[PDB]
Design a binder for these strands. Structure first.
Lengths: 78, 103, 95, 97, 97, 83, 105, 93
DNA sequence: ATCGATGTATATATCTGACACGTGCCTGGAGACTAGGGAGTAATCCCCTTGGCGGTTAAAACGCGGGGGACAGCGCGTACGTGCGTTTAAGCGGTGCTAGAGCTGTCTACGACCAATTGAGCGGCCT
DNA sequence: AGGCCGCTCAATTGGTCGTAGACAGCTCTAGCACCGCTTAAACGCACGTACGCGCTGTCCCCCGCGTTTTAACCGCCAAGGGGATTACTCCCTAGTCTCCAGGCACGTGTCAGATATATACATCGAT
């Protein structure tokens, strides 16, 4: 469930961003945007996996799906 | 080998094979792999020396991804080049806005 | 088993060339391999596109030079062009 | 003693801009990833490094979004971020129509 | 005599210029500016007319999009007047140096 | 002939018309210099790539396809001048 | 039915697309079904855009299509706008809208 | 010399869609640019997909997956259906 | 709030410059055939993913008290919008000239294919 | 992770052949420059008013601290699915020659829409 992304985790993520004081309604908005981003990336990765006739989602599928959206990621056998 | 003739550390033959097999053009000229390998070696040497300086600045003996992230972000040209790239386990640079600073 | 290829040994040589008494971890080496591959694909793709635009079927060092000029920023491109031309003329002179 | 509000916040700001660790718990994130993926193809297996890559990308994206949101909040002469700041940042960046 | 109150002719102009599709900048000054910029790169250059026309199209579209983002930023801060800081915030969020 | 300081040929009413097409209702007096600087940066960024494409072909005239390719390079595709 | 397009029941040229795929440097070999599939997709997209453009032109009591109608058709449809979100159309103009707070009260 | 274009095919499709409607020269230029752009995008994805799996051939399966990656939902579904119908018609006859 | 000033979409002539139909012809696509190698198919091995058990303990959840910050309201003064008269130079329509993009012919030097050889680099274990 | 052992497979060397392109010539389209003219648009000025900005008061809702709880992280054990590799063969695509018709360049007729302009109607603003 999306509720496993607790409030203190979101506060830590905000504190890395430099945010000093947080409203009470930020948490639902953050959960929504995170869910949307994950759906897009996972859909692309599953398409890449299913083309290769596999049943396991590898790291290279995620790397290709991220590179597709202009979010190149280094460190995972690129 | 063709690397010693040009005085390089990168493999000219491997680059030639990759260009030939990589589906870029019908034919590949003779001097393209040498030029490309020299450019790649220059770029990696620059990155490595900046990262090593950052590592020594932190009183450490080996380079970790944090040092690479700091080196890339502190240099303006390399930050412009690798602007849409995320380095795993690299973190962020410490900066707090002026208005947020305590009075 | 699978015989993967990497630039670990050449990166290590360059590192010991510029930093003799320094080491590097596996994560940083993998990041370096990813960076090298990224730049290689960028340069090669731009050069192939340039050759295709002008109705040439070959990739020479002129296309590589122009692609480097298009992709890298100013001073970095100037230094990279200098190094590449120096290497090319050294290779041509020797035999 | 009792800390005046706003100094502890700066303390964890300094603490968390100095480290590189992951901030979200791993098991809840993995369960969320599998639950989302069930909608596209059932009975899917995941390499562990795939889930780690997904977590790294998600954390980076959220941190950058929060930086832009804080910038927007400062623009409107406030100190607290609000949902309208997130909406404006996402609209300028081109994600939300 | 007769005088319209401020803000009416502005809306009328907004409707008029969103209705049409013409280019909004004069041609000769833009051509002269393009040639002046290009002198700094290579000497004795010649331009096709369609090249200058394409440059003008692209520049006008870019400026219109920037002004839309600037208006959004101005409205965010409870204003109606656009100011340079709105342009700066828009360009910083969009990722432009 | 020598060309100098032609940026001011982008007059104030032209800026105001561009703003009105964008929905702007009220404009400050300091907007015009900011807009001119932004436009100069954009043109300097595009014309450099166009002239590089021109110089590669050993050609002395800049054509439309050079500009189209340059715009493609910054992710700013343009339709209507060749493909 | 000599031409491949007539066999496949299309309007776009299968042979030209095959030639471009071969002399475009995409792969060492090209199969026999790729040109047909790609031509069908391209024809579908072209017809989809032209339908909306013709409707928009008829809305303004005009017979011929001009770039304004293409711009309106693309920007009024959600998925066509999503596909072509980073594309500029010459002489297209902008979509007419005004924010609520600027309207008279 | 000879300059290739898609003008005739675009006109045929338009006459099928709106039998009593014309098109300007500038609109047909925009149509040519659009067709070229979409062709290039799909072909590039097909090439990358073939290279990732270490294959030397681009088949209709690569084209289908490239279309499925690029086009949004309903548009992608309809495009896939049209392509499959066309390939079936070609193979049967 | 009727009414006066000003802006706006409309009906129509006209007049044109561009849309659409025709014809010749050449260059590229359709048809038949052969020959080799990419990949489809089936088997085998073992790596790595999924599942379950119990511990300690780190972190999330709850509640309360208090102050810092967001927000509405008030007042003032500066900077922007509107309209009018004057100055400027952009746009139009010709002319003439010539530089350079573009096509043709050839012949020269350069890259692909192939046979044989070797040592450079990837795999695996150590300190 | 730096270093060393093993070896095997990709890089080195050399020769032949076919052709991509470098160079030279020549034709001709289109870019550049000049002249005058009309008027459309930019410049400058003055006034008024509406909105940007500072200040103040209130109330609320975020933060920090302490207690209880709950489930994440860790270590160990069991089992099997499916990813990676290997061998065989077959059928699908490339390359070649022949021939022919679809599409491109040039030519031309005529008609849908851009101007000029008078007008009913909408809309805004002062007394």
């Amino acid at each position: 469930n999306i509720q496993g992304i607790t409030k203190p985790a979101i506060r830590r993520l905000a504190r890395r961003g430099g945010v000093k004081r947080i409203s009470g309604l930020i948490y639902e908005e953050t959960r929504g945007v995170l869910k949307v981003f994950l759906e897009n990336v996972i859909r692309d990765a599953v398409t890449y996996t299913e083309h290769a006739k596999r049943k396991t989602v590898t790291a290279m599928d995620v790397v290709y799906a991220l590179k597709r959206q202009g979010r190149t990621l280094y460190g995972f056998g690129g | 080998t063709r690397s010693s003739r040009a005085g390089l550390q990168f493999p000219v033959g491997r680059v030639h094979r990759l260009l030939r097999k990589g589906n870029y053009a019908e034919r590949v000229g003779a001097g393209a792999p040498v030029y490309l390998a020299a450019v790649l070696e220059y770029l990696t040497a620059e990155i490595l020396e900046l990262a090593g300086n950052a590592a020594r600045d932190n009183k450490k003996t080996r380079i970790i991804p944090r040092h690479l992230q700091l080196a890339v972000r502190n240099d303006e040209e390399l930050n412009k080049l690798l602007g849409r790239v995320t380095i795993a386990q690299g973190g962020v640079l410490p900066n707090i806005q002026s208005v947020l600073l305590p009075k | 088993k699978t015989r993967k290829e990497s630039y670990a040994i050449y990166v290590y040589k360059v590192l010991k060339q510029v930093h003799p008494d320094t080491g590097i971890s596996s994560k940083a080496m993998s990041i370096m391999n990813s960076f090298v591959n990224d730049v290689f694909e960028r340069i090669a793709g731009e050069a192939s596109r340039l050759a295709h635009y002008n109705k040439r079927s070959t990739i020479t060092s002129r296309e590589i030079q122009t692609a480097v000029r298009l992709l890298l920023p100013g001073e970095l491109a100037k230094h990279a062009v200098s190094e590449g031309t120096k290497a090319v003329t050294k290779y041509t002179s020797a035999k | 003693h009792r800390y005046r509000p706003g100094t502890v916040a700066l303390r964890e700001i300094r603490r968390y801009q100095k480290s590189t660790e992951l901030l979200i718990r791993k098991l809840p994130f993995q369960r969320l990833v599998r639950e989302i993926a069930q909608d596209f193809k059932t009975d899917l297996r995941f390499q562990s490094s795939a889930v780690m890559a997904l977590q790294e990308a998600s954390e980076a994206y959220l941190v950058a979004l929060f930086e832009d949101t804080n910038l927007c909040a400062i623009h409107a002469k406030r100190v607290t971020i609000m949902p309208k700041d997130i909406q404006l940042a996402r609209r300028i960046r081109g994600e939300r129509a």
